Every structure is written in C-alpha cells, then in structure tokens.
Amino acid sequence: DLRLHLLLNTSVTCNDGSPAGYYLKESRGSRRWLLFLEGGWYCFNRENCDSRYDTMRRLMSSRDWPRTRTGTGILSSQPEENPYWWNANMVFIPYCSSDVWSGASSKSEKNEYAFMGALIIQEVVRELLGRGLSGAKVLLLAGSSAGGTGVLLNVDRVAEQLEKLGYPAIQVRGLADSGWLDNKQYRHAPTEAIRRGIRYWNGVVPERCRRQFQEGEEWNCFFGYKVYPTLRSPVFVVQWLFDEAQLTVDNVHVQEGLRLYIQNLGRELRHTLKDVPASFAPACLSHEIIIRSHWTDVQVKGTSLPRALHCWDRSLHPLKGCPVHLVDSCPWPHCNPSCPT
Ligand SMILES: NNC(=O)c1ccccc1OCc1ccccc1
Ligand SMILES: *[C@@H]1O[C@H](CO)[C@@H](O)[C@H](O)[C@H]1NC(C)=O
C-alpha cells in the first residue's frame, strides 16, 4: 500500500479546485525513486469537461480519493511481481487535470476549471525532496497512456528543476508506456481536439520542441515521434504496435482494405522506433502494461520487459545477451505468441 498525501501548497489543484496529491511508499534502503503518472484521456472544452465531471469525477477532483492504493506491476514491492525495481521508493501521482499533464492555468472568474498538470508534477517533486528524494541517485519518471505522453512532455523540465534547485547528482530518466501517430483514419479530426485543448489549458510543451514548430503549432509536440528527438534525458519507450487507443481513434473495430490498413499501421509505428535505442514494441493488440500485475509475461525475441529495463539500467552505467532495443518485425496482431489474452 502507498499512502495519500495532499499537496501542502493548496494553490496547486485538480480541475475543480480541490488539492492535488500523490501516494507514497518509502524504501529507506534505496536511493531509487519511481514517480508514475496515471492516464485517462482528457477534455478540451467546457461542455466536454462538464460531461467528464459527472461520470469520471475522480479524474477531476481529490474529494473522493481513498487514503491508500495497492502498488502493482512496476509499483509492486514483491520481487516475484517486480523483478526490475522491487526495492525502490514508489510514487503514484493521480491524473486529475484532464490536460495530458501539460496545463498551467488556475481556476479564476474566467476559468470554470483549473488545468495544472505540468505544475502538479513540479510541486510533487518539490515536496518529495523533504521526504528523502534529496538523497536519490536516479529519478525515473514513468507513466501510462496520457501519462506516457506526459513523461515525454515533462521529463526534461523535471531535470531542469532539480538542476536549478541545486541537485546535480540526481539522474532523471523517463519511461513512456502506451503514449506514442497522427495518421489517416480508416473511416471518417482527432488532432483538432489537441490543438483546441492546448489553448483551453494554457498547455506547455518542451522548449526545444516549441522552438522547432513555433506559435500555433505546439500540438505537434504531443506526438512521440516528433517530440522525442528534442529530448536530452534518457527515455525508454514501450508501445504496442497495434495499440487499442490508436485503433479506436482511427475508427477500427477482415477484408483486404482493412488488412492493408492494419499492416501499414504496424509498419509505420515500427519505422518511427528505428532510431530509438531503448524501446520495447510487441506485435499485440492491447493498451498499457507497466502497472499490470502480469507485465512480466510478455517477451520480444525472448526478452521480457522487466529484463529490458534492467539492461537499460546497465547501459547507463552493446551488452552481451542483455538487449535494450526490442521491436517485433512480424506484421499482424498476436504474431508474437506471448501477447496478452
Ligand atoms: N488516450 N490518448 C491520449 O491521451 C493522447 C495523448 C497524446 C496525443 C493524443 C492522444 O489521444 C488523442 C489522439 C490519439 C491518436 C491520434 C490522434 C489523437
Ligand atoms: C504554490 O504554488 C503556486 C502555483 O505554482 C506558486 O505560485 C507558489 O509559489 C507556490 N507557493 C509556495 C509557497 O511555494
């Protein structure tokens, strides 16, 4: 169990103005810290956010949060469930800002909701330095789905924040799960929601990416294959080749037209990962993995995800029999026998 702490700075809030927070389980014999960003889509105007507040309120408010959560997958403290970092300090940061962790706007007389995702991450980091983070050797910022995209948008800002606060020894790294294409749909734009959303959230993107695409075009930096090349921090990318959220937005739910569509989608995703040295991309139809309890089951070319992350740690001290770049080449969902059921 990880125990809830509401932010001491009550001006950093969820959508409805309630305090944001984090769940923490300390491991005093470890100098490794895992900060995990939750996912869960987003909302991009008043009417769409009002609907989310009726039936997804825990993703917009802390008023009903439980005092504990069970750590699972990479957040589990059992060696059998988590071969990678079972002894780390564990942090789960709930997603209550509906802004893909990009926002920096407070509730006010002209804003019905606050969108503070980028500031929530910084304040969590700030308050953890008083509870042990000051002695860390590695800070791994991880996340799934919208939280995976949030890793890509925030990992270099966390690095910069610790540098400016006087902590040069903490190595900041990223792990982005299921947050990696602005492709043509199979049937008939989803990118327009992101464009409109950034403007609604006062959303912020990494500076080098901002400078490449310039004003009005920051939505491009929400797409992994465009923002990843601008990042300095080491980032490991986990992405199913046939991601279910990607297929949903593409309006896919088999004859030749769809067969070619699906095969091209896998081809394109594999192409964008060619020059990503730390990555894990199985040929499966699925979504998310790193906090699922059976995340140890899937393998690419005989290597599990916990093993690949361990090999990544070793590389940041090619390695013999301990690979870090693992991308399926077979071209159809579940041609990898270890895919989830
Ligand atoms: N669940 N998905 C997210 O959170 C997300 C995060 C970053 C960028 C877009 C996202 O979805 C919208 C979308 C997905 C695929 C193609 C176009 C648009
Ligand atoms: C509280 O957070 C707000 C919003 O980020 C910031 O303006 C302010 O400096 C913070 N207060 C303190 C005491 O750090």
Side-chain angles (χ1 to χ4, degrees), residues 9-12 106 116 119 123 126:
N9 184 341
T10 45
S11 280
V12 178
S106 308
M116 294 198 83
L119 297 167
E123 183 69 31
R126 180 169 299 290

Side-chain angles (χ1 to χ4, degrees), residues 74-104:
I74 200 172
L75 287 168
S76 169
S77 297
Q78 288 291 270
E80 290 68 37
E81 182 160 342
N82 183 8
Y84 176 49
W85 287 356
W86 60 266
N87 204 30
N89 299 266
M90 308 297 192
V91 181
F92 178 102
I93 308 179
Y95 182 39
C96 64
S97 55
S98 306
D99 57 2
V100 182
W101 297 93
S102 78

Side-chain angles (χ1 to χ4, degrees), residues 283-291 293-337:
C284 311
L285 174 77
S286 195
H287 188 59
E288 301 189 326
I289 180 180
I290 62 175
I291 63 165
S293 295
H294 293 79
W295 74 283
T296 60
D297 290 343
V298 69
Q299 302 176 353
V300 175
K301 296 159 163 53
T303 299
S304 77
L305 176 49
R307 180 156 180 80
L309 296 166
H310 159 66
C311 299
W312 185 46
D313 283 9
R314 287 187 56 198
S315 74
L316 296 173
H317 294 165
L319 311 155
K320 282 70 55 183
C322 189
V324 300
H325 176 95
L326 291 162
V327 178
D328 284 329
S329 55
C330 58
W332 195 256
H334 205 310
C335 57
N336 184 334

Side-chain angles (χ1 to χ4, degrees), residues 17-28:
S18 56
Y22 60 95
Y23 293 79
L24 171 60
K25 176 206 181 153
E26 282 184 64
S27 181
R28 291 185 172 251

